[PDB]
Design a protein around this ligand. Structure first.
Ligand SMILES: Nc1ncnc2c1ncn2[C@@H]1O[C@H](COP(=O)(O)OP(=O)(O)OP(O)(O)=S)[C@@H](O)[C@H]1O
Ligand SMILES: Nc1ncnc2c1ncn2[C@@H]1O[C@H](COP(=O)(O)OP(=O)(O)OP(O)(O)=S)[C@@H](O)[C@H]1O
Ligand SMILES: Nc1ncnc2c1ncn2[C@@H]1O[C@H](COP(=O)(O)OP(=O)(O)OP(O)(O)=S)[C@@H](O)[C@H]1O
Ligand SMILES: [Mg+2]
Ligand SMILES: [Mg+2]
Ligand SMILES: [Mg+2]
Lengths: 386, 258, 319, 325, 261, 261
DNA sequence: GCAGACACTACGAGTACATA
DNA sequence: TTTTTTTTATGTACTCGTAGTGTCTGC
């Protein structure tokens, strides 16, 4: 059934040796699942961010023959294979995958009975039945009470006897604060371009069509190290009319370009640091900074970070004119927020997106600034309330 | 072309409220011997095996082997408009996406033709569950549903231990402890209330309460329930129906025994 | 029976009648011929033909199985957290027999109105049942659609229509409707449309119904010249500190009946993409927002707009 | 029979012939009605130009009195027009037929700028899908508050301001039917102070007829309180010719005697500055200064100090203008 | 002066609980013949006509005709506190706005005067065509209410078809098709349960389910409901109260489009 | 040391949801005759007296006179987990600052104890005068629940008068007034429906609507409700909780506004 | 005939955001 | 290679929990 399936599903990994993630993360998830064998399978033998994960794997066991980390949280951007690695590792270690998604009801009672059904009884087949591995995709979309139910069933001293894998897209969600102090925190780096280009070459060669690796590297840089977006874009651009991909088709913006939710630190880095050396025009940098700062979201946090980070730079304006007009711009934003929240005229919120591009124009430097998270306004408000 | 003319609509009514929340789907396997449903929970907890033979219906016609992947909640709105004493014509075409149910439920000539969109699932195969059960007993159905409701008042799990005197049911909770001891009740006029003991190697296991009560939802459907359980092998309740077929259930025990 | 307007009567029924974005429409035609289309998101300006392309592709792929293997959902439907869980998912699992290379198509038009949680719940039903069903989404602002949905599709992007692409379909509608015309009137229709084919058909039908002939002054009697093309020249006059011509254009736009909110909004949109210095553009935008605060609090006259123009002229002469 | 109604509602153009100004737009709308091809309309413009009255005349011409309730669903800002209404009553009205007589329906949405963006986004496929059965008319004053999809779906007619040449005979008809004595300068004052708005022209005419009984330029400029052109010219002459204390005394004496307000003085002075051949820098400075004074009068401020600042804005530039030579 | 008097209060309760979620305001048209009420719903899709005879009242006097606009949300909170074996009094002066709703408690001792405030919504009189219907069907109201509830489970809009054999109800919904066809069931002991066909031309129309179940709340009013249908003129759900009058309903068909293929 | 045993668990499942929204604390005073509860609101408008005698308890042991205070927020969540026909036992030690509440089954091996922190509240007894009123009448409990919900749809303040003909309930608002006068229903089979008037001086006063509607969810606690009020004495609503004691309520009159132009 | 159980809709409550 | 929290004052929309309540079953 070659014409009945998507290319992401046809070329999907089924074994461990054809995964495309970072190798460390795969070893860490496999070694985390392989130490669960003492309590589940009843067998003693199975057969920086690096140092903390390598120390915590060999940290020993608590007096319940179970790991000190009871769930594993898989964080990263979309399109790397977190669900694929979780399913492949669970099927590799003899477990049976139980899928939790955002398409379920996810009410606290439904969450509680489904975790208690998945984890607290064995298989119906009896001997030879594979144990149940709970995989919870999109845990960041779950409510606060669902995470509270999960932590309540995590800390029963009715003990948890089965592993749980949690997959999220953003670790800094307010609903996953407590989970990060109890989970096996696995951070996903973006995929390497060499392995990605080689896998796209295998995908194109198995479909009998040619694409040189320059245009594949251009597609990799355009789609942000995304396997799913690049394979879908190759499926749209190939079709059956032509076999050789052109560079101008990928360099065109009409197909495969998606809006990317930029992080706060990436936005602050692009505002305070000039791009290293076409792209030297200042208007292009103006539009790029404005578009990515608008596409990041959470405008108040960006304003707080710009307020807390613009005085720590190596400022070349010794006359403090740039600092004065930056404070004028911040007061202009504050006046606009007050006028929008006072007169119920919310059409005044098109201008405070131009505050980060004003800070980028004022404080464009070629140095490497150390941007810290904003906290002075929040601690000031807490202290004032106290 | 497949046709199944069930002589009473009460028996197909009482099947489905037992397995309403229990299974998310119904897989009617269609054969010349009869209907077959080897359904399985996605969390590998409970298994439902249902088989009604061809001679128990008003008529039965089958051309070739067929399977009905059927949404179970979508079926349940048909039986809310069905009757207790009526003829039900469960029919389907050979290569089609529909499943029709024709009946005259309110006994007022009202020919109701309710169609159902089929759904396709993956073809998982469970051949034969092994039956080497050490402990088999027979119990009345109506007494089994009451004691499952009695232990549902206080606790959240039942410890079930078979013994030569009888099956012992125990539960614990913060409110209190519910416990009864089964005795030999064969000295009664009713033959269904008698408990028969043909067991050896007594075992003690723990089972969930939310799955045990819905096993006993179809207790007016059959008079006698056969309990089968042993070590490292799931508990079986068995609903031997009078004429058209039989129903059995499976239930994996809890990890934390006793 | 009632005769349809020319926007909906002359909707294309095949993919070869759709003009503009020739490579994307040609690839959609190839997909419609062969099959096995992937998940698709089409983004672009209004009136480009995203709904037309999606419906033509679905009609050519499915054909006689249209009424049972296509689920169309719009913003007039609910599409909440319950509709995705019980309606998209049940239709995705639903068994529909189809020829090889053909799948069920779930059309989610205007996906910007879809909530964030519903799009989060849309992901796993999109990935699991992709062997049987496919998705076709249409949107105007692609930033409202979340990133995991956009990663699951080939995000196609439509550009604004070229004047020749509008002109070819204008020839088509004119020869099936027998409309007398001149060349300058059709350039006026194209100028009033501004990349919008709906506006082109609406203005052509209005000019044909009101006058029966397409010249320039028959078009401009009922239609209007576009507003920010004058605002660009007035902002250019404000750049060279020429207050007289800027006030002339401002008074011409004031006597046409435009509210101060619309004028200052088009001023801000013109100054967003204008070609000047970056710092001058930033202080211009700050001055525009400062004037828009006074417009929003209640005072909105020609004097405030003239004061905004004079302050914009002052910003050039104050380094 | 005689009725107790305001003159802006007693004299309403029930037919399309009684409207005065937008002749080409109304001819096109009448040709749309007569050929049974009326599309989705978008009537926008300044207030008082006749957008509600146009669609009310259209609904009265299209449908008779025995079937008006079955064809027109009129919803304005006074009714709740949420997304429940768009997904509920509006969708059920659009997707169903007519009870009495076969024909196309009409959904009039007055004050469509006040609708939320969710309702406007939900309105798109109701317009597009059921365009054969019903037509939607959106009437707004601000076109920026309507999403571009709804602007694309509906053909737009800009109901611009009413020019005083064609605005005279409707006022003459109202005068003749109301038995009002009016001079030529009174009608000129009406069509000047109205400024493209037939509602406030009739309000000024009714208020002047009640206050004085006659409509003259003196009576209109007394009842409205507006300053006359000669007094604004005198104020400009005093601000450009004499010193601070004498011009202040003259303008304060005029404002005390006539009971003038500084807002109308600022408006007419702003109109007279662009006619006077000023230098560019002087005009820029004057425009910024009067913008500052007219902003300052929107709060609890003293009007005398703002009048002194209004004099000051010209006493600054007197020396610059003279030394420019 | 207007002084009507309901002989039992259960008749008024069952009328206004059927228009509670359906109609916007009660526009009582008063004459010497009886009390009329001809108002559309909020969506301008359905039309309700209610005519109560003067002979069914206890005492009825009407010196001059009145148009009586009364808000129903405030009105429907007074029939909650009304008995069913009890006396309902309706009063209206010549040039006043108060509407005395005088009755007794279920404890059956006390007068209970409740007042309304009249509204000034002018309404153009909607002309009922009174044309012949190509399908006239007599059917019990309990059976018409039951299969409208069963069809709301399956679909959103129901295809209603009538012919020589009988009426037919089809609901092309999400889960599939639900088809109910009933005929000639007059061979029973009861006289209320009867399906009778009167006219010949076979029609097919689609209606919204949310208004058909709204119309069937008048089941305690009449044992048998008359169904009138034709190709152009809409569907009529006709309740005939035994000794009070009649309740007349209208519901416009939906717009359907055939596939081009 | 305080330990008491109840006959039924539905008494606390009918008395304690009534004060869910009136008072912010539950102060129980221990005496040899029985328990006493006298509390006020934060608005100082309603006073509640609850006196349950010691003769009806299954057991009662008391040695000292103490004063304990119980909060409402944790208490209301506990009683939803409790039963209906069970026995409710309580425990409180002399030096412990934690009241024990047990809602075990009448035949159970184990108990369920949901204790709460004793709130140290410093309040004083205002002291009811227990003077002779102007009118004392007896009313049904379930009928009083309906007539308090009756006037909630009309206005926000109601007027209760009590003359020699009967007790007049009035509620004037923007919609319309409603007058209710219970009188003379001694000719019934039940002894519950006997509405009698004992005294004679008529008094007209205005009382707030919300606090009477907060009272009438405790109506199946008793059979009849006794209503006592005077000209300046606050309105007293008397409950008699079976054989174990009685309950008394107090409403100060609602402040009537001015009349202007 | 009346007590218990079932789903049904109305209502209270918490949260997010509103621009190009 | 670096992450907490409730303020802005309405209006609206979404989502979820809860509570009367009509109706069905049974001895
Ligand atoms: N080595 C590979 N070669 C080809 N396709 C792959 C490979 N690994 C994964 N994929 C495909 O790429 C996708 C991997 O993403 P998923 O694991 O499904 O979701 P995810 O990567 O966790 O991101 P999100 O947040 O769920 S959208 C799937 O469609 C896989 O079929
Ligand atoms: N590319 C095109 N070629 C031909 N006709 C077109 C084209 N685009 C639009 N039209 C016409 O305009 C009508 C409306 O087009 P739509 O597809 O509805 O616009 P759209 O791209 O969906 O924009 P939105 O986001 O829905 S407002 C169609 O029925 C056609 O008559
Ligand atoms: N073109 C016109 N011809 C004649 N009388 C007019 C005209 N425009 C307005 N009027 C008068 O002004 C009154 C109000 O007109 P409307 O139609 O209500 O104005 P409008 O266009 O609705 O403006 P807005 O935006 O709704 S305030 C009418 O009743 C007429 O008396
Ligand atoms: Mg995933
Ligand atoms: Mg569209
Ligand atoms: Mg208007």
């Amino acid at each position: 059934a070659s014409s009945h399936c998507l290319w992401v599903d046809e070329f999907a990994p089924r074994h461990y040796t054809e995964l495309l993630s970072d190798d460390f993360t795969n070893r860490c998830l496999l070694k985390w699942l392989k130490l669960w064998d003492l309590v589940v399978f009843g067998h003693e033998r199975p057969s920086s961010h690096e140092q903390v994960l390598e120390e915590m794997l060999e940290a020993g066991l608590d007096p319940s023959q179970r790991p000190k980390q009871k769930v594993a949280l898989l964080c990263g951007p979309p399109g790397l294979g977190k669900t694929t690695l979780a399913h492949v590792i669970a099927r590799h270690a003899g477990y049976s995958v139980v899928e939790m998604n955002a398409s379920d009801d996810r009410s606290p009672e439904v969450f509680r009975t489904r975790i208690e059904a998945a984890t607290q009884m064995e298989s119906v087949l009896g001997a030879g039945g594979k144990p149940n591995c709970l995989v919870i995709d999109e845990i960041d979309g779950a409510p606060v009470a669902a995470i509270n139910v999960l932590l309540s069933i995590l800390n029963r001293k009715g003990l948890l006897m089965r592993p749980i894998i949690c997959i999220c897209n953003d670790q800094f969600a307010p609903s996953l604060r407590q989970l990060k102090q109890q989970a096996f925190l696995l951070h996903f780096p973006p995929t390497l371009p060499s392995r990605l280009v080689q896998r796209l070459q295998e995908v194109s060669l198995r479909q009998g069509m040619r694409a040189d690796p320059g245009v594949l590297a251009a597609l990799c840089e355009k789609t942000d190290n995304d396997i799913r977006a690049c394979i879908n874009t190759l499926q749209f651009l190939y079709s059956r009319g032509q076999r050789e991909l052109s560079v101008r088709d990928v360099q065109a913006t009409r197909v495969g370009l998606k809006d990317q939710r930029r992080g706060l630190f990436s936005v602050w880095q692009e505002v305070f640091q000039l791009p290293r050396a076409s792209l030297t025009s200042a208007s292009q940098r103006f539009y790029r900074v404005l578009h990515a700062a608008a596409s990041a979201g959470e405008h108040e946090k960006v304003v707080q970070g710009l307020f807390d980070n613009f005085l720590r730079l190596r400022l070349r304006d010794s006359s403090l004119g740039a600092v004065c007009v930056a404070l004028d711009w911040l007061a202009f934003d504050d006046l606009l927020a007050g006028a929008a929240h006072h007169s119920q005229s919310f059409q005044l919120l098109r201008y405070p997106p131009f505050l980060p591009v004003a800070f980028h124009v004022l404080f464009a430097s070629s140095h490497t600034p150390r941007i810290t998270f904003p906290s002075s306004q929040q601690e000031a408000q807490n202290r004032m309330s106290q | 072309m497949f046709e199944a003319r069930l002589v009473q609509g009460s028996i197909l009514k009482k099947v489905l409220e037992a397995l309403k929340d229990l299974i998310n789907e119904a897989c009617w396997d269609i054969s010349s011997s009869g209907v077959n449903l080897q359904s399985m929970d996605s969390s590998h907890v409970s298994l439902v095996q249902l088989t009604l033979r061809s001679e128990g219906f008003d008529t039965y016609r089958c051309d070739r082997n067929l399977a009905m992947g059927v949404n179970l909640t979508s079926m349940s709105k048909i039986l809310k408009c069905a009757g207790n004493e009526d003829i039900i014509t469960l029919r389907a075409e050979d290569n089609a996406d529909t499943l029709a149910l024709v009946f005259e439920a309110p006994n007022q000539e009202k020919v109701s033709d309710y169609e159902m969109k089929l759904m396709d699932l993956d073809v998982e195969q469970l051949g034969i569950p092994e039956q080497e059960y050490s402990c088999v007993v027979k119990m009345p159905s109506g007494e089994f549903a009451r004691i499952c409701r009695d232990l549902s008042h206080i606790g959240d799990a039942v410890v079930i231990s078979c013994a030569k005197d009888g099956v012992k049911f125990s539960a614990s909770g913060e409110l209190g402890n519910g416990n009864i001891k089964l005795s030999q009740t064969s000295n009664v006029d009713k033959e269904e209330e008698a408990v028969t003991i043909e067991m050896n190697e007594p075992v003690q296991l723990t089972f969930a309460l939310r799955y045990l009560n819905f096993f006993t939802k179809a207790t007016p459907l059959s008079s006698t329930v056969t309990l089968s359980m042993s070590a490292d092998v799931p508990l079986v309740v068995e609903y031997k129906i009078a004429d058209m077929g039989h129903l059995k259930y499976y239930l994996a025990p809890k990890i934390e025994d006793e | 029976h009632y005769e349809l307007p020319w926007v909906e009567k002359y909707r294309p029924v095949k993919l070869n009648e759709i003009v503009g974005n020739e490579d994307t429409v040609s690839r959609l035609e190839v997909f419609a011929r062969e099959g096995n289309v992937p998940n698709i998101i089409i983004a672009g300006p209004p009136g480009t033909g995203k709904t037309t392309s999606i419906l033509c592709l679905a009609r050519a792929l499915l054909g006689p199985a249209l009424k049972d293997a296509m689920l169309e959902l719009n913003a007039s439907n609910d599409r909440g957290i319950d509709v995705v869980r019980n309606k998209i998912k049940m239709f995705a699992q639903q068994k529909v027999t189809l020829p090889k290379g053909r799948h069920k198509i779930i059309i989610l038009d205007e996906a910007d109105s879809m909530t964030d949680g519903a799009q989060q719940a849309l992901r796993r039903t999109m990935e699991i049942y992709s062997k049987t069903t496919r998705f076709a989404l249409a949107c105007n602002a692609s930033d409202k659609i979340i990133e995991p949905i956009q990663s699951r599709c080939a995000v196609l992007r439509y550009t604004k229509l070229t004047d020749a692409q509008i002109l070819t379909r204008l020839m088509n509608v004119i020869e099936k409707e027998r409309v007398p015309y001149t060349d300058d009137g059709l350039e006026a229709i194209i100028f009033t449309a501004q990349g919008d084919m709906r506006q082109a058909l609406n203005n052509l039908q209005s000019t044909f119904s009101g006058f029966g002939f397409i010249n320039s002054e028959n078009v401009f009697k009922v239609c209007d010249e576009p507003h920010p093309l004058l605002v660009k020249e007035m902002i250019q006059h404000c750049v060279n500190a020429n207050i007289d011509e800027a006030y002339k254009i401002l008074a011409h736009l004031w006597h046409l009946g435009y509210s101060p909110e619309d004028i200052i909004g088009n001023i801000f949109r013109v100054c967003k993409t204008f070609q000047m210095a970056e710092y001058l553009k930033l202080e211009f935008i700050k001055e525009i927002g400062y004037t828009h605060m006074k417009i929003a609090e209640g005072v909105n006259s020609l004097l405030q707009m003239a004061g905004l123009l004079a302050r914009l002229c002052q910003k050039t002469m104050a380094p | 029979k005689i009725r107790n109604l305001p003159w802006v509602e007693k004299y309403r153009p029930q037919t399309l012939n009684d409207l005065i100004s937008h002749q080409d737009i109304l001819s096109t709308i009448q040709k749309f009605i007569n050929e049974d091809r009326l599309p989705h309309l978008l009537l926008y413009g300044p207030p008082g130009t006749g957008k509600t009255s146009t669609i009310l005349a259209c609904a009265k011409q299209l449908y008779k009195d025995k079937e008006f309730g079955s064809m027109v669903l009129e919803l304005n800002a006074s009714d709740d027009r949420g997304i429940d209404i768009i997904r509920g009553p509006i969708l059920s009205f659009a997707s169903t037929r007519t009870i009495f007589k076969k024909g196309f329906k009409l959904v009039i949405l007055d004050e469509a700028d006040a609708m939320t963006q969710d309702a406007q986004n939900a309105l798109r496929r109701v317009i597009e899908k059921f365009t054969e059965n019903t037509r939607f008319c959106l009437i707004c004053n601000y076109l920026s508050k309507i999403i571009p999809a709804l602007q694309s779906r509906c053909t737009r007619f800009r109901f611009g301001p009413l020019t005083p040449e064609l605005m005279v005979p409707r006022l003459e008809h109202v005068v003749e039917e109301e038995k009002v004595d009016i001079s030529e300068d009174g009608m000129k004052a009406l069509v000047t102070l109205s400024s493209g708005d037939m509602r406030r022209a009739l309000n000024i005419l009714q208020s002047t007829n009640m206050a004085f009984g006659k409509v003259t330029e003196e009576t209109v400029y007394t009842c409205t309180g507006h300053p006359l052109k000669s007094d604004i010219a005198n104020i400009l002459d005093w601000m450009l010719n004499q010193d601070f204390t004498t011009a202040y005394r003259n303008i304060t004496e005029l404002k005390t005697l006539k009971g003038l307000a500084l807002h109308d003085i600022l408006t007419e002075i702003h109109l007279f500055v662009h006619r006077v051949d000023f230098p560019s820098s002087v005009r820029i400075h004057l425009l910024t200064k009067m913008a500052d004074i007219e902003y300052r009068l929107s709060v609890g401020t003293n009007e005398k100090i703002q009048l002194s600042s209004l004099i000051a804005a010209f006493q600054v530039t007197r020396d610059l203008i003279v030394a420019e030579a």
